[PDB]
């Protein structure tokens, strides 16, 4: 196999003097020789303070240098870094270290979710981000520290999904390979010093870790740490930073085509050849501004945690309509039925890809959750999808969304996708209320923008307008002032039907 | 791990009904899913006649859709093809398969070496290739057949190298991978149907099979078989069949450019984005008519059959001077010193790369040969090297060409690049005579053009005018009417010298 940091030590062995990381704002840049150095010098220091291999540490930080430090000194020790989002709650954080049996906790948020950990229960040491290194520099202690031997199946780094409470994804050492290499086979970056990676997809998340961070430092190039996203700020990165890849949430790219279209060739965006994303749920409407004002190959990816990339599209005209690429092997099969009861071709069901290399090993402490999702070789999504007569997979929606009224299948997705364009909407969620005509009645739940009245009769009178076949229309609507949503900005579906 | 069965069986999945081999020539056409039915077939078919795992077999042909088809199924079956260059001496041959206590070999020579095995002494089962497959179709019986387990270090091909006799690398499972990625990483190659390799080099070559042939089918791609070269039919190729990539020998890239230049806008090559090869040999002005008349981005790589890919470069200026890419890691030591013996930057010594996941095992009984080669996690190239001041590694020649004279490093293949640009030089080769001034003589074999003369007076005072440092000028020149060569056209330097 190749493990992460073999992958970063190769690197550093070919490019040590070539700038690894950069921080424009601060004005901090590593060559890969450096942050070797400081890689070690932690890895070391925590060492000599009782943290062994594979005991799982705690990391709770929004995206940083001194972030991409610590992760990596954890695994250049040996310990398995789980990797926590910063926006959770304090409680919630605290739950999941203590199901965790996590060893210790590295911490930049706030006095206040320390509190959180110090009590909450389980014994997990506090270390405070700034304890270990601050703007690029580490305080070391002890001599350098041997190299663990690290084995295919061992877990090596643990990254959350999302009813309620986040699950804990064990990604194997044998994973870290093709978690990265995907971007070259399918999105097409090449090993070389040219590559310039924006990092605005935040560390937490796997793509923002094993396809952003890690791919920029193993193809010798250099990751541009985004401490703050900031649309016309970001283009200027791309500018100043000679960007060649970006990887972005749907939301960051609506951001920054809205700029790239209010700036004009007022920024050189040359350099950048690159848009990737997950745009599934991306509206059509984003898309196209994407083609219109941003440049590079644009190409949609479609990926989980469990098993990172499935699916993709260079040049996507709807971005719900994907094709697997290398690594992967994916079927549709009926939903709720074995990995062997594909489907008849155009009746939707169930995407499940194979378990090879790529995917995790299960959920730490859930066999459960483990065994709804590892069967007979394969990963179950969870996402409803249908065989396109044009050789694509079309991804229709979450299962749990799925909305079945008089024994039809009704996508949510696409009834909030056509309301969302009415308007004075500014917020829409569609749901399946308990539930007759029967089972299930299609409801709208709608938020106006500021100071707009809607009503039921124009919002139906829109979507009688639209494409939607007749038994899709909303059967009810319920204008809020605002949808109930967690931590992490996710709708509530479970609790809104309660409150209606 | 992910093998070649493994890689060519979920492109299958990906692209069933795709053109997977095509011989324009002959007018044959395979899908990668009609692909999948004849390997299945045969394997099952030889499977059904004794032939069972990890027992090696001989495969003795020139390139034809036909052998693709039985080195595929052989490898399907768990068998470990042992693949050998057809222009080999039967006597030869013979003694590779005696020595390689093989079950089979794969025949598609002629009567004449069929004979040679014959006779011989090893027990080796001998197979007409036309006896499993012809023109794309199988003679199958038996039931379908299991797919055997399949380690990571367990042998999967034997490739053969080059004093006397070559040696049987033997390249386990876990190679397949990167031994095809580095196409991707290195020369940019992306998964994709728009994928058409144009098959020029040898499937007993690593390169012409993994680098071509695996990574072709592995991509969701189109392998064009060649039967036979022919520079101009080939350029056909490139716009008939909208070839995008191209790996080439350093001869085949001299015919092709001599035919582009002597074409014109007659050829549109236009779908060609890539003209890969193995130039460090390449004389300057060979690569400089590539760049001026051949399209698509040029790479210029070096590699082994041990190790596969080692150093690369993007549009090179000369073909001797490349830099590691993705999976290497490389070293330049002291000539017959330790692995940790790294030279002073500047001085010349042995290019080592780490034997990580793509590198052999083992020659097949030879463990002495195995103890010169692997040691101490590195593998030894026997290439001498230097680093520039750019941060590059330029290859100066092998280790058993280089003259030692008078305490100073001379590598023949230097001076060979200049006197063959002598007016009436159509061949020559630099040995270093036993031996004195001292230690060895600087001596030039040289072979006239068709009916010119050639006097050691004029090539010397040629070489006065070279760049050539004094103590590089040869000290001596012998006219041949030929060089003796062995049956794969390499010069016999231990044999020359006796002779002179
Ligand atoms: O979580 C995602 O959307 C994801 C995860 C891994 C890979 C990709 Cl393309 C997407
Ligand atoms: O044998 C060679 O020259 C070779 C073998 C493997 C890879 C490469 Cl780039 C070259």
Same mark, same amino acid.
């Given at each position: ?61 929004? $995206? ?20 926590? +989002?910063?926006?959770?709650? =304090? ?8 199901? @965790? ?35 690029? #520099? ?56 040219? $590559? ?44 100043? %930073? ?12 609506? *951001? ?40 590079? #190959?644009?190409? $949609? @990816? ?25 690594? =992967? #092997? ?25 378990? =090879? ?7 730490? $402490?859930?066999?459960?959750? /483990? ?37 039809? +299948? ?15 909407? /500014? %917020? ?22 500021? @100071? %707009?009245?809607?009503?039921?009769? *124009?919002?139906? /009178? ?39």
């Amino acid at each position: 196999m190749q493990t992460v940091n073999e992958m970063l030590r190769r690197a550093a062995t070919r490019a040590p003097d070539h700038c690894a990381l950069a921080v424009p704002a601060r004005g901090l840049r590593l060559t890969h020789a450096e942050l070797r150095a400081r890689v070690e010098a932690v890895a070391a220091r925590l060492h000599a303070d009782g943290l062994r291999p594979q005991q799982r540490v705690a990391v709770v930080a929004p $995206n940083s240098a001194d972030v991409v430090i610590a992760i990596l000194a954890l695994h250049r020790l040996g310990a398995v870094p789980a990797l926590l +989002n910063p926006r959770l709650k =304090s409680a919630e954080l605290a739950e999941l270290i203590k199901r @965790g049996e996590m060893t210790a906790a590295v911490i930049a948020v706030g006095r206040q979710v320390a509190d959180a950990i110090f009590q909450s229960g389980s014994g997990a040491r506090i270390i405070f981000l700034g304890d270990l290194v601050r703007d690029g #520099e580490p305080y070391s202690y002890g001599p350098p520290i041997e190299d663990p031997q690290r084995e295919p199946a061992q877990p090596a780094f643990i990254f959350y999904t999302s009813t309620g409470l986040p699950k804990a994804a064990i990604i194997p050492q044998r994973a870290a390979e093709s978690r990265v290499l995907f971007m070259s086979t399918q999105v097409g970056l090449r090993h070389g010093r040219h $590559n310039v990676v924006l990092g605005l997809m935040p560390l937490y998340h796997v793509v923002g870790f094993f396809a952003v961070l890690v791919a920029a430092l193993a193809l010798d190039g250099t990751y541009v740490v985004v401490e703050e996203f900031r649309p016309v700020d970001a283009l200027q990165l791309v500018q100043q %930073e000679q960007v060649t890849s970006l990887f972005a949430t749907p939301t960051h790219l609506d *951001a920054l085509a809205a700029a790239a279209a209010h700036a004009g060739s007022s920024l050189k965006l040359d350099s950048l050849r690159h848009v990737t994303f997950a745009g599934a749920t991306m509206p059509d409407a984003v898309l196209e501004t994407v083609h219109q004002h941003l440049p590079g #190959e644009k190409v $949609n @990816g479609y990926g989980t945690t469990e098993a990172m990339n499935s699916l993709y599209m260079r040049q996507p005209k709807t971005g719900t309509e994907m094709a697997p690429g290398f690594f =992967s #092997e994916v079927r549709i099969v009926r939903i709720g039925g074995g990995v062997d009861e594909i489907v008849a071709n155009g009746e939707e069901g169930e995407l499940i890809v194979a378990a =090879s290399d790529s995917a995790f090993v299960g959920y730490l $402490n859930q066999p459960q959750a /483990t065994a709804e999702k590892l069967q007979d070789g394969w990963y179950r999504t969870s996402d409803v999808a249908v065989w396109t007569p044009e050789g694509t997979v079309r991804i229709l929606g979450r299962v749990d969304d799925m909305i079945i009224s008089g024994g039809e +299948n009704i996508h949510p997705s696409e009834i909030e996708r056509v309301l969302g364009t009415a308007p004075g909407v /500014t %917020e829409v969620v569609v749901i399946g209320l308990a539930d007759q005509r029967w089972g299930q009645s299609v409801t709208a739940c709608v938020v106006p923008r500021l @100071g %707009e009245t809607l009503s039921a009769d *124009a919002l139906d /009178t829109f979507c009688r307008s639209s494409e939607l076949a007749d038994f899709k229309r909303p059967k009810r609507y319920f204008i809020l002032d605002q949808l109930p949503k967690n931590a992490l900005n996710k709708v509530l579906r479970r609790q809104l039907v309660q409150q209606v």
